[PDB]
Amino acid sequence: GYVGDPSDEYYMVTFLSGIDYWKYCFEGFEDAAKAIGVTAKYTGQTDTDVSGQVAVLEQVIAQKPKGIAVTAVNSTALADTINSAIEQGISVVCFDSDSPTSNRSAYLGTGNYAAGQKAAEFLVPLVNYKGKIAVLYTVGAENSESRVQGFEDWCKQNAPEVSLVKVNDAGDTTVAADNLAAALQANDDIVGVFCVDGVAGTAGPTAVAESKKDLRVLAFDVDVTVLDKVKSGEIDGTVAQGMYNMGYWSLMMLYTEANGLSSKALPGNLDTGVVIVTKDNVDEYYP
Ligand SMILES: OC[C@H]1O[C@@H](O)[C@H](O)[C@@H](O)[C@@H]1O
């Protein structure tokens, strides 16, 4: 059953691996590991370098863990490595950002397309259903690309006078602020900014402030600096993800599969939910 052996290891593998976002994800992973009695391990690529993250995942596969929960920095570039891990007998699920062409057993995380629709439902009314919205996001990551597509589809169906400007945040807060600054310079009709991920939630408001433009801004994630800007009204809100539950249930699924406790293959998708954070509930999200 669920009496674990501490020599059995389960790895969480990330990108942008030092940011606080992963501390909440790993807290859930480790809490489940401790409840079962196995050992949770953490590592990742420190930036968004794709070949870098492939190498990190290879270093993990070489330690022969029982299971790996990985968030893929690119939608397809980790698929062969994931498939290799599974061929070597390691259980693999994806959390937070999927590798949907790989053989991973399950995805656990935000419903990213739906969250982009929810973001558009929030932001479009605030700009009175007209004008251009800058969408600042990590090109190549499945979760960011799906959030963008949900936002874009919602506007196409429900706000015909709204148009989008896509802006790469490049996984780098300095480059992201420069790229949004350039977008604002060239597009006088921008009225709002959707920061699609945590990098953009930091860089976006910074670029907006430096432009001195009065824009509607929806951040992503719950960095204290972002929450403080919701509380002051500098930005209009942010989007909180179920970080802890991504980690907790990734560990439970990995251990279940690795020990053959379920007669069927794992269920394919756990929706860990989003909450729109405004002044009304921002206090709940401080550490
Ligand atoms: O940009 C930093 C982080 O922001 C989050 O919104 C995404 O879910 C993560 O995949 C990403 O690593």
Numbering used by the authors: 33 to 319
What is the paper's account of this structure, in its own sentences?
The crystal structures of both unliganded and glucose-liganded CbpA were determined to 2.10 and 1.85 Å resolution, respectively. Unambiguous electron density for β-d-glucose was observed in the CbpA/Glc complex, indicating that the ligand molecule was bound in a single chair conformation. Hence, the structure of unliganded CbpA assumes an open conformation, while CbpA in complex with glucose adopts a closed-conformation, resulting in approximately 37° rigid-body rotation with respect to the unliganded CbpA structure. The glucose is bound via hydrogen-bonding interactions and CH-Pi interactions with CbpA. Furthermore, the binding pocket of CbpA is distinctly small for the accommodation of a monosaccharide, and no additional space appears available for the binding of larger cellodextrins in CbpA, thus explaining the functional specificity of transporter A. However, in C. thermocellum CbpA, a phenylalanine residue (F47) occupies the corresponding location and thus cannot form a similar hydrogen bonding interaction with the substrate. In addition, W54 in CbpA adopted a conformation that is also inconsistent with hydrogen bond formation. The reduced interactions between sugar and protein in CbpA are consistent with the fact that the affinity between glucose and CbpA (KD of 240 μM) is much lower than that of the other binding proteins (KD of 1 μM or less). The ITC experiments showed that among all of the tested substrates, only CbpA binds to glucose, with a dissociation constant (KD) of 240 μM. Unlike other monosaccharide-binding proteins with strong affinities to the substrate (KD in the μM range), the binding of CbpA to glucose is remarkably weak as shown by ITC experiments.
